[PDB]
């Protein structure tokens, strides 16, 4: 029914359009590549609704995000990540969602990395998957807000831990003990923890060993007070 | 069909605008499914309350907020008084809305307005802003509902693309 | 450089017209924005088919994480990659010039100016925060130096000592150094 | 030159009246009282307004002084200088023939949660009642008329004010009073 | 070359729906005034009126004017534009033929309140929590002699008598009475107070609350 | 200020900060060094201030030897009001037209969940300490004082007389 | 008022420590060493801290003085007023009963690239090691819990800090 | 459409632009019906007076304000002088244009441009800047002309 | 069939002039370059980059020639390195001018030193242009 008409949309409607966003949406590819925000979350929800409605065919999700923002710039909320995550979980039973991490996936995007359909969830070997320190760089409240503020931040931090255990099949106690400082996994460590299912090694590898930099000279003679030379590699 | 779908994830917004969107949802004669994702402050909470009863869903990690409007006044003494009457009447308007959307006593709702009150999914159901917690199976059912409602337009579009191709 | 150039039958923008031929012009210093656009473009171009992607670079510099993301996307795609240097390739642009087509597919225009330097960065906070950031940046220097050394064929220890300051090269010095492979001429 | 005038028990209140300006004047009046209790003080008011808090501070200082405190307005006395000028000793308030006297309510505002908005409206309404109550007493006019007049944005000549009960003498013998 | 005639809904139902939203509302004969009466809104509304009374066959299909603007005065009570933007809109809306239905979504203030009243009797709608308010006209700060300020006072008194005339015709009261009640001080109306005084006539048609629907279910 | 200073007058004027608190503390310590018996009087006119600076001023007032009589001129608001309420018993005066305000502490915070929770419970500590001291100074219980400080509590000087903040009025 | 105390051998280390203020305090301590090698020097502290360079300079000046140095805390001693509060003579460190004392680890500035960041991170590791060492020396506490508590900014009441070791007396016993 | 309908509502603009629109409207062969809605300030008053005489309409609620050219200028004494003389020549140009559009003498126009000058609908028609009150039937017919 | 480059550029960075010169030489069918009004350094390079025999200047046009510009910041050795590259840029620009004008490269370097203005006829004589419009 709708397969031939994805074809026909390609023939008449979705081939000509110029925008790279339009071409990507034609290829069922959703590139999350920017501090996730309110506008980004609404865009991703619209894209994912329409992509469901097209077909039960799969979706590709490339993630190069630095969290909700960088720590040196004003953060947004944690609710955009939860909104996108819930949309993805609702979608997944009717559409496979490969989720692939190119580059980086800091904190919130890490959730969006772990929210892909199990077994179809990958990160490049040269990526980093950060479960960063929790959270909220917004500091524009007063003391008249204290009575609410705790019941928010826990309310946010604990919500994330729960969702992360529903993606790594782990104990939320571990995730809580791991939040306290930003802990960023290698892809192999991530597969061990459960964040991703595979690691995408490149076809060809370039970087080799650098251990040939090691000195290996003898231990210093007991009668040689070393000078203060402070060198660089 | 023509039952409106509102997707709500909003951390703020003036209370009057939330009241406006609530009433707008109200005068639409068909239903109105409002699904809150992640958060809904005062304006977005008023939008959520305005959905058809039986179709105000809130996701597990969603946090609605009942509170009174935040304002600012500048003018003469009579201007100060008349504008504070603005704001108090708006508080009573919101209390009226929350009673006619939750069945809670307007006294208790006004107290909840006095100090900004956050609510999580279960408690948001408890007060009466939403009917169902949008867990994953609920979310699946919602995207199924979107499937069925959009599929009429989809079939129209099917036949048109058949003609054009 | 705005005017849409005619395509198979219609008027299409110059850069979109180029990407219709797999050619990816990178002309701005690599910030989060340009890097995301070029990563997206690379992924979609690899999606259409697998023939080859020529990157024409005029990059005068850029940030380290977005450039490494673009590099990893170039290496991830099935289709091979060739990088040409129209104008100049500085810093992370000179690192992208050593990111595509190791086997003799890096070109440069005759008066192109090439420069490599160790990646920069800046971050402060607690004491321990500075430890974590400094360790990460040293990891980044080492990774980009491994990539540079395996791209050009120079010793890793040589690259470390060379790139600590700015390093500038004429295309003849770049061929002799291994940075590029051929210099474009009138042919 | 202000040192010699302060020796002569003359205090100047000129320009906008503010918190620190008030504290300075309060101190001068207390010094003049504690030095000499039988010799009158003269306060000259050329001021376009002020803060209600600072104004009431100066007014309290003026009403504490054992030595009768005359006031002599020159140029402007706008809505807070005028009140203080009306708070000199009865029969010893003076003005220039062409000074301009204004009586008017204060401004204000509030923000955020409207709890503080209602509290600010209550405080602005207090200022209204407080000022008007004492204004009515010294102007010797019905409190209703004073409440109505303190609403209306308007200047008056010292002749109109002298009729209205605020000031009591015009320095110039009403020979240079121009409308 | 050929005169391209804009074809209207009876014969344009075969050309599909319009692409975006404002074209949709224009086709439905709804003129949504969501932004204060700036020269831009005036130009756009004049052009919409010119297009709507251009080729209506019956020109009895009413024109809807929904308001979400504080008129020609900014939120902090200082005029953001002049009273002539209102006149231009009002005049324009009069040179059409169709009955002019007006409604308020959230705020119809200070000029939009007059324009609200100025709809058809029996056909002025509001949302049940719309806030209506009438304030005296306000000029913006200009410098000069006593003569310039006197000229501005004369202009503002023409504007005040104009608004009082429209409000007298709408609310059915004495002209000077309407001047005293509404334009003399910035006064607020709930929907019920506004209905009591003739400002509005009805809620929007079909407005039915949610728990009311529930209890009729 | 010197003209007042030689009169053993210490001015707590304007919203308090750490610089104003440093100046007040230096004045008070010097004045205690000059004469440990003869009294210090101190005019209060302030809309607030940082809680720590007010606490510094309050402790400096407490442990020095001369009684620091506090006379309110104009206004005393929730941190200058606490300072005014802390003058020597029997020597907390008000001008007849001054107003007195009490309300809870204020301040912002930024950082991780841990750090801003720590800021939250230090604000709770400030609130507890201020309520305890106010209970010591007025005589009302923790509950009435906590209710009063909870919301903006504007008061007249006379009410403050029967509510304990002030000892008398200068109508004299 | 400050100078009239500077004849009574009192120094106000109030406000944030910066280059100019710390330079002023160092100069005053040189002067007070000059005036009398025996009479007590009292330093009143009220500060959210400042630079660790300037604070270490003040510390060096305080331990250069052949005279005794008393420290008193007014209100806030935070992250460098705490360090300089504990630096008084053993047995002569005081605070007001309602003063807050908060311990912390240093912070650094930013110039350049990854090699320069290496240089600055080595600086700040050295500074953290030195602060922990000296602080665990005059508090008579092991380095383990000093490293533990400095890394978490936690305000302390004077009795709590007195049990910790920063101060020797509370003025009033409260 | 052998007429060009020009709808006026504008609060100002440099007077040179009003002169340009006046000259253009007086240059084209085709007639012109200029309608004022709400206001017509300096340049708009020139554009309103510029239409075909007898078809310069103004609504009941319109105002027409005409003021002398206002300029600003910096520089040496001779430059100030020369720009001054030019601005006076512009004032005379505008006075003469109003004088020829309304048939009033240039000296009564110049007397009125001394200060900002507001005119109602009756005042504007009496003065001569417009010729007829705009009743609904007027641009009933105008729209019908554009349609016929 | 031949790129016809109309030039009127009061300025620009010299490196961009070099880049446009290289782009011009890259295509094989000749390039015509017609300068109007002004052709400053980054555009003087472009004007000299056209086909010898097909470079035209207009009677009113003036040609600017000058050495490159630059700002530097950093340690002493960074300043030394950056100075060395700006010198390399200036040497390259002199070489391009020598290729187009057939004049002593050292003389061209001497003329680059300060801002250098050429009328249309002096542009023809120097060698940057061939004919007058």
Automatic annotation (TrEMBL), chain A:
Species, as recorded: Chlamydomonas reinhardtii (Chlamydomonas smithii)
GO biological process assignments: protein quality control for misfolded or incompletely synthesized proteins
GO molecular function annotation: ATP-dependent peptidase activity; ATPase binding; serine-type endopeptidase activity
Signal peptide: none
Family: Belongs to the peptidase S14 family.
Protein name per Swiss-Prot or TrEMBL: ATP-dependent Clp protease proteolytic subunit
Gene Ontology annotations for the cellular component aspect, listed alphabetically: endopeptidase Clp complex; plastid
TrEMBL record, chain C:
GO biological process, one term: protein quality control for misfolded or incompletely synthesized proteins
Domain of life where this protein originates: Eukaryota
GO cellular component: endopeptidase Clp complex; plastid
Molecular function via GO: ATP-dependent peptidase activity; ATPase binding; serine-type endopeptidase activity
Annotated family: Belongs to the peptidase S14 family.
Protein name listed in UniProt: ATP-dependent Clp protease proteolytic subunit
Organism field: Chlamydomonas reinhardtii
Organism placement in taxonomy: Eukaryota, Viridiplantae, Chlorophyta, core chlorophytes, Chlorophyceae
Coverage span on the entire protein: 73 to 259 of 282
Automatic annotation (TrEMBL), chain D:
Entry's Gene Ontology BP terms: protein quality control for misfolded or incompletely synthesized proteins
Tree of life domain: Eukaryota
Record-level GO cellular component terms: chloroplast thylakoid; chloroplastic endopeptidase Clp complex; endopeptidase Clp complex
Active-site residues, record numbering mapped to chain: 79, 104
EC code(s) of this entry: 3.4.21.92
Molecular function in Gene Ontology: ATP-dependent peptidase activity; ATPase binding; serine-type endopeptidase activity
Alphabetical keyword list: Hydrolase, Protease, Serine protease
Family classification: Belongs to the peptidase S14 family.
Identification of the protein by name: ATP-dependent Clp protease proteolytic subunit
Source species: Chlamydomonas reinhardtii (Chlamydomonas smithii)
Residues of the whole record sequence present: 66 to 244 of 345
From TrEMBL, chain F:
Secretion signal span: none
Molecular-function GO terms, alphabetical: ATP-dependent peptidase activity; ATPase binding; serine-type endopeptidase activity
Top-level division of the source organism's lineage: Eukaryota
Any Gene Ontology CC annotation: plastid
Keywords from the named record: Hydrolase, Protease, Serine protease
Catalytic residues identified in the record: 78, 103
Keyword Transmembrane helix: no
UniProt EC number: 3.4.21.92
An individual GO BP term: protein quality control for misfolded or incompletely synthesized proteins
Protein family (similarity comment): Belongs to the peptidase S14 family.
Protein name: ATP-dependent Clp protease proteolytic subunit
Full protein: residues contained: 72 to 243 of 256
